[PDB]
Amino acid sequence: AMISRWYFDVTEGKCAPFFYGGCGGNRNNFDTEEYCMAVCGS
C-alpha cells in the first residue's frame, strides 16, 4: 500500500511524512505528526 505516516528526521530535528507500505519496517513510524513529536521531539 501507500499510506502517509510520520517519522522523526534527525537532520531536521522534527518529524516528517513518508509513504509507508503498510507492513514491516521499524518503530520510527507514527500515524500523526503530534504522536511522533510527543515520542521523539525534544
Partner: peptide, 13 residues
C-alpha cells in the same frame, strides 16, 4: 534509539 532509525517503507510498498 527508535527516533534515529531510518524511515522504512517496508516490503508491502
Amino acid at each position: 534509539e527508535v527516533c534515529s532509525e531510518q524511515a522504512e517503507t517496508g516490503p508491502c510498498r
